[model samples]
Target: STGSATTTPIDSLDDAYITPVQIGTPAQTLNLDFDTGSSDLWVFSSETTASEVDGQTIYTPSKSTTAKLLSGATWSISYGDGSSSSGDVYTDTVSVGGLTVTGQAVESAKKVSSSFTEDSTIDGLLGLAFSTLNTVSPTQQKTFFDNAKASLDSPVFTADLGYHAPGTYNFGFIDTTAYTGSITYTAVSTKQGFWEWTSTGYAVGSGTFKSTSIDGIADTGTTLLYLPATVVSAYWAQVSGAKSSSSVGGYVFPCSATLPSFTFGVGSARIVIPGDYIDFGPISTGSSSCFGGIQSSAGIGINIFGDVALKAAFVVFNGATTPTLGFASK
Candidate 1:
């Protein structure tokens, strides 16, 4: 019983993200990113200091009429890149797709890095990926989806965007009408709070791999998948002499080339990624070459299977119940 689905670890973009739950009244909308690696919805605010507000989009409480600030608590959040933001908290209405929930707590960071602040098209991130990554304590407020559990049409599913093509990128309910298959889960590791896996190797075009044991973290916060050098070399070998397009950055191949299908063994699940996503957009000055999803994070101490690799299957994140990740096809 197979169809189409994929996923890969993805770095959380400061702009162009989402909040899967509903918030605010009269529904004044805002954007949020889904990062299981870290949790907290910090967006730009009009009330923030001018210097701190450079390239980020700010949320204006005055405009919402329904927004409320976090009592006496002020806060700050930092990423792996040394970029950070600080602001107060507030409760109000928020929404994702068609679902909306009231009294959702939000962080209004006044300070942010230039990369995040300067993005005009990008909004803010809504972290819907995992439970342990919740940056905001329960004393603060639960995630947007933290409350949407009761309202989900099914187990809960989300689709990653196709390199920023419009349409609701953060789709909450996978069209259950289009899929009818069984859902499966892989127990999480207590050490890193990530979905650990044992790879059954990979194949391009079409082939099956046996017990290719590879351990890594399945992340939605970051984009791109980074595997062991040996494993990556092996995977590329299967793609018909797909050489590294660049000496630096992730692997990239020509966009026109048909990428072979790939599958990884995650415990009992066989996660997959198609070829189109394997080749990234043009990378050269004239857009002649492009980069794919694998990169040089092998020495980063931990293996990360970013969002680019996860796009091939149905993923069910249940932070509400024991914090497990379920996979299936739709």
Candidate 2:
């Protein structure tokens, strides 16, 4: 079996991509952030405090006849900024774009940080990272994709993320029409629970490609591209008046500045990220200072090829006998 789903941008900034998933036997639908950076299929639920609920939808297990409590299970996860949530677990029938998986672990959030509570667009997160990253205590749970793989024609998924536009995610088979030319396949290291791969090199604009091996994770949940400080410095230097700002919290430059295209190599294929994609968004409302999408990963501890890079091409996460990542220009 195969399945496909449309991913909608949460806002004009394309801060995150959201997909609707059905929870429980009665099919309660909730829009969820399909995050490739984490492995926890958690959601806002009836258990969450009313004050933290805001306007987001909640998954009510008590309303679902098929919902079964996962006894002695609990989970707690924190994001980059110390923002976090803790929850109890339940196994229920979950479905995504017509692909159904029974006995799926659903983390019902009892407490959530302020950031998640204030965000009205996403009700929860559908983690796509390897199941090894799951946070359920006593025994970790499998991710939605990991559970659905058994029924899929092929244990694979494709991400066709868009820039300020609607994106599509396909499971089981690659949509050849979604990309051009041929896909360049590369080995993916899942040891750390991420779909991490290595790039051959990179170039700023028309500059010659630098032959260096750069390891990074393909993270759809992340909003920007983060690389070595040197690579980030190289790109920012080309833009006049682009500087690291303490007030802005990152490298910011004049909104009017012309940004050069960024190119990175996957195998032998070079995928170019448009200049606009790197422009990111304004530092403040109607402010001339624009934050760069490509940032330094020096402090972050690892390089991340996030949405800014992923949206530039078609990506395939092949969960074959050995995991692999394939990139194609689209």
Candidate 3:
């Protein structure tokens, strides 16, 4: 059988995206970020520090009839900014769209950092990455997708992200009519616990593609597309007055600056992200310069094809033992 979910953009600019994951018998629904960059389905729960709970809803496992404690199990994940969320574990009936998993491990957040707390757009995260990235200690846990993989009609999930509109996430079967053109498939390296793959080349606008490999991960949770420094500079060079600035972080340029489209290859297949998508938003409200959607990943350690690029393509994450990724959008 298959399940489908309609994703929600928090705002017009969509600084973040979310989907409802209803928990428990009575359906204690909470908004969650479907993050493919990490594993471990954690939720802000009744146990989360009272002051830390912002406008987000909490998953009260105690109120759920099927909830049970996973004795001695704990989980912690640190963010790139050094902040983190840590908590214990609970097993409960979890439902996402039409699919449901009984006894799904749910990390109950006892603590969440200020960064997460301030952003009330999400109450938790539904990690769809490889189970190897799960953070539960003593014994790592399987993600809802991994746990339900065997029962799915097909071991695959597709991400159809949107720009101003809502997106859709589908499990079990691929909707052939959902995309145009042929899809290019590439072997995935799950050793790093990511939907990681290497691209054949890249091109800025209509320019010839540079035949240099770009190793990166497709992460829906992150908002920007980050590539090698030289590649980033090449793309930015086309825009007048574009330059790196520490004041606002990453690369920024005049809000009115015209940006060139970015293209990256998936073997013989290529995906093009339009210039409008790269403009992003302003550095700050009323600012003349805007933050770029594509930036240098030098400090980030690995190139990341985040939502900026993903929004422009159709992506399939194959969850087989020998996993692979499929893309089509050129």
Candidate 4:
């Protein structure tokens, strides 16, 4: 009576989470990145140019009897990282875990950016955001979550993201055992097609907690936390040897430098992110410099609580009326 799915991180990057999904008749399985920041279900397909295929497994719609071409339908998307993908559409049977949606819109990518082509493991993206963000032209398409919600026992899903480890994404119903303590609930605004919310304030180390309401989104596809320039500068100032590195395109610090924990206030809830997590990894192999996972969202106009922030808590994306974000310590 319920549906669910497991999400795991790619060994090399570990920046994004991928889940298995079956498309079309007899099932063409693909490892797709489940992104909450965008809305479009697309994959590498037979239509892709051979030169751009690289090591990706292409989906062949011709092999599926149930696949139908959505005439005149097309889609294109550019990500925050500057990578992009675009292609035609096909209507087919799509299934995730135990949930199946007949005649689901599956965008087949005919062209993809180099970043995606080089990342051989990721086939495409399964967007969990609202359908309004779907890139398909002429007629917008509903996401898998949107299409299957009515049949679900409950219109809810849970994101259990782990650090350098595996995590599970349960759909339809919430399993209370996946989280500990009480789940701190916060209201979300979906007018922008993202799980957008606001944090009351934040603090670095043991300094005073500033009470500035920050409008931001919970983006699972993004790798790092992005805040305003002023906030990023303040957090890095607390660490000796930390500096803005043009080559790194962000802030970097000495590998041996000790850092302090960062905290974000969600209403009365204080979500603490450990200092060690802030040190993403070395800037380069055998380098003494490490990149900070927290960066500035200067042009983006909104802060993003990416993987570096989400892994610190068990998040629940409640799809019910009001659409809330529930967070708790893992």
* Reference-based lDDT, residue 100, model 1: 61
List the global CA lDDT of all models. 0.58, 0.92, 0.90, 0.89
* TM-score against truth, every candidate: 0.76, 0.98, 0.98, 0.96
For model 3 the TM-score comes to 0.98
Worst 10-residue lDDT window, candidate 1: 1-10
| Total colliding residue pairs, candidate 3 | 0
Candidate 3: what lDDT? Answer: 0.90
| TM-score winner, 3 or 4 | 3
- Write candidate 2's Cα lDDT for 142-192 as tens digits: 999999998899999999999899989888999989999999999999989
In candidate 4, stretches whose alpha carbon ends up further than 4 angstroms from where it belongs are none
| Cα misplacement distance, residue 164 of candidate 4 (Å) | 0.5
Candidate 3 structure quality by residue, lDDT tens digits, 143-167: 9889889989999999998887898
| Residue 284, model 1, lDDT | 58
- Of the two candidates 1 and 4, the one with more favorable TM-score, higher being better, is 4
Identify the candidate with maximal lDDT.
2
Cα lDDT of candidate 4 equals 0.89
The stretch of ten residues in a row with the least summed lDDT in candidate 3 is 77-86
Q: Which stretches of candidate 3 lie over 4 Å from their true place?
A: none
